[PDB]
Design a protein around this ligand. Structure first.
Ligand SMILES: Cc1cc2nc3c(=O)[nH]c(=O)nc-3n(C[C@H](O)[C@H](O)[C@H](O)COP(=O)(O)O)c2cc1C
Ligand SMILES: Cc1cc2nc3c(=O)[nH]c(=O)nc-3n(C[C@H](O)[C@H](O)[C@H](O)COP(=O)(O)O)c2cc1C
Lengths: 104, 105
């Protein structure tokens, strides 16, 4: 399926893992996206209000589900039904976020 | 939904990441399973022939999809539709495996 993992402890919360499904969805290769913040999928018609909700969820370190317009590598639009989830270590400190993406 | 990631560069290919869905499916906690090979989900009625296929796929470092009986922590049986996928680094060396579990109901 389609999922990624980011490290919020790294500069700009970059993707450190992406499934093959994510690669197929976005048309990007693994080498092209590792180490980058997932926001590169956003564009002109992406709703900023929804991005803010994502930003608030990340700050508050809570799970969230939103729906927003993303763009493929070739410039094709798709609605991304995005589910985010924080992962904590054994000491209860924030360690990762994981996201599950769905093409509408 | 349900997925894990293992590290084949570590002894016994242990789980190093698990989604909340995986935790809910198997009734195990995150601390309980990190650092362990995923084989603990197998039990009495698990078909060894299927286990052998998985082992072959991991050896060959290719993706595979099987269905097999697994067990929750409490011992409840469930059909696991399991998909495995190898992941390589930029130099082409095997770096991870990821697995996706679907409950067959
Ligand atoms: C694990 C994870 C996966 C994400 N996946 C996407 C995505 O697929 N598409 C998208 O537009 N934003 C995604 N985001 C959100 C962006 O990375 C970023 O956090 C969001 O645009 C708000 O941050 P910003 O205001 O600094 O851009 C994801 C975030 C996380 C933590
Ligand atoms: C990423 C990954 C996920 C796996 N998930 C499961 C699983 O959910 N259930 C299961 O019975 N085996 C699963 N396995 C297979 C076992 O970890 C192990 O490879 C299999 O039992 C064969 O090894 P063995 O014959 O030495 O026990 C998974 C393997 C990998 C690499």
């Amino acid at each position: 399926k389609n999922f990624v993992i980011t490290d919020p402890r790294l500069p700009d919360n970059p993707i450190i893992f992406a499934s093959d499904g994510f690669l197929e969805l976005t048309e990007y290769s693994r080498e092209e996206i590792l180490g980058r913040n997932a926001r590169f999928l956003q564009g002109p018609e992406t709703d900023q209000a929804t991005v803010q909700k994502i930003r608030d969820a990340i700050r508050d370190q809570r799970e969230t589900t939103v729906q927003l317009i993303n763009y493929t590598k070739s410039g094709k639009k798709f609605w991304n039904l995005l589910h985010l989830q924080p992962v904590r270590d054994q000491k209860g400190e924030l360690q990762y976020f994981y996201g599950v993406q769905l093409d509408g």
